[PDB]
Amino acid sequence: AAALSEQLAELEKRSGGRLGVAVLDTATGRRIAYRGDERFPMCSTFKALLAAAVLAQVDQGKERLDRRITYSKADLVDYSPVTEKHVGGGMTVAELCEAAITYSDNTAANLLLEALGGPAALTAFLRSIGDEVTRLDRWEPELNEALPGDPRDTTTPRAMAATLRKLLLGDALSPASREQLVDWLLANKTGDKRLRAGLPADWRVGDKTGTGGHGTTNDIAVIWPPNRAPIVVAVYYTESQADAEARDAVIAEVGRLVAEAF
Ligand code: NA
Ligand code: NA
Numbered sequence: 001a002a003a004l005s006e007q008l009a010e011l012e013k014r015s016g017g018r019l020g021v022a023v024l025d026t027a028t029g030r031r032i033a034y035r036g037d038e039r040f041p042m043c044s045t046f047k048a049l050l051a052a053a054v055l056a057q058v059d060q061g062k063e064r065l066d067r068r069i070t071y072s073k074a075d076l077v078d079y080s081p082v083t084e085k086h087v088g089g090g091m092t093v094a095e096l097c098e099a100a101i102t103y104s105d106n107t108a109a110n111l112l113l114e115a116l117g118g119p120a121a122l123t124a125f126l127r128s129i130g131d132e133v134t135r136l137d138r139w140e141p142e143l144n145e146a147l148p149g150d151p152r153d154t155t156t157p158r159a160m161a162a163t164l165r166k167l168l169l170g171d172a173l174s175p176a177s178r179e180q181l182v183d184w185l186l187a188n189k190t191g192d193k194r195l196r197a198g199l200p201a202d203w204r205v206g207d208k209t210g211t212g213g214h215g216t217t218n219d220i221a222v223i224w225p226p227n228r229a230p231i232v233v234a235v236y237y238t239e240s241q242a243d244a245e246a247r248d249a250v251i252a253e254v255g256r257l258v259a260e261a262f
Contacts, residue, residue: 004261008034008254015250017215017240022157023258024165027229036158040236041146043210044104045160045220046122046136046153050112051097051184052167053125055177057116065094065180069111078141080107094180101184101208106140113139126163129172133159144212148239160220161234168206168222169230182206185222193248194219195233198255202226215240217247233258 002010004023012019012034020035057063070090076083082099083091084107091099096112099105116122119136126134136143137152145153155163166172168182185206194217196205203225210218216238223231235254240247 004032004257005034007257007261011250011253011257015237015240016242017247017250018238019250019254020157020234020236021254022161022232022234023262024161024232025229025262026165026169026231033158037156039151039154039156040218040238041144041150041210041212041214041216042134042136042153042155042160043144043146043212043216043218044106044109045155045208045210045218045236046134046143047100047104047109048181048185048208048220049126049134049136049163049167050109050116050122051101052173052177052181053116053122054093054097054112055173055181056125059174059177063093063115065092065097067093069093069096069115071107071111075107075110077106077110080105083107083111098184098187102187102189104190104209104211110140119143129163129166131159131163131166134163144210144216146212146214146216146238148214155236157234157236160236161232164220164222164234165232169232182222191219191221193245194251195221195223195235195255197248197252198257199223199259200225203259210236211244212238214238215242215247217244217251219251231258231262 022033099108134155143153207221
């Protein structure tokens with residue numbers, strides 16, 4: 001037999017690449033990590049944090065979810081499945097948050113960054129809620145480059161699990177904004193082959209995925225088993241030589257290992 005952290009090490013060994021995991025069981029405070037303090041490229045997982053920062057502006061009376069943002073075809077960057085349909089007519093701030101979170105729409109994220117004040121404003125938001133580790137440096141789509149050894153646009157699994165707990169289950173947002181943020185992650189459409197695929201069917205998942213260069217596949221989540229306190233799980237996987245479906249399977253296996261331990 002072996003501890004969960006040892007099981008994750010064996011998963012890493014047979015999969016190749018570099019795997020980072022942090023888990024927090026909020027019932028007990030049980031915490032476990034594997035490469036929990038190493039930096040990993042966030043890729044789209046930052047969009048959960050971006051939406052939170054926007055909601056904090058709403059909480060402060062500095063932004064409105066129903067504000068309509070009009071843009072142009074010149075704004076469209078790689079991978080924008082929702083915003084590329086709304087150059088005509090635009091989209092509201094809420095719709096952009098939903099697109100960014102549930103479809104990993106890259107232009108939506110840039111438009112929300114523009115509304116917020118950019119990557120330094122998002123990073124400042126994170127410092128203000130006690131995350132001294134996570135950093136957004138670039139805009140879409142360059143922030144997905146995921147160069148090994150590059151500290152730009154990175155987090156650690158422990159920092160991200162702590163931040164996601166703070167945002168979805170903590171004091172950072174108003175009750176209404178916290179509910180809205182949870183709502184968006186519960187509605188995610190990009191995660192069915194990742195953590196969700198390894199968890200029992202009646203566990204409820206709110207998650208945000210990330211995908212990038214140098215074989216990067218990520219998934220961060222708050223998970224509610226039936227009639228039980230939530231578990232926060234952050235998974236970062238990079239420097240893999242495996243194809244996208246195989247990397248999804250690595251994350252799904254982390255989910256299964258977590259479900260078999262907890
Ligand atoms: Na910790
Ligand atoms: Na593939």
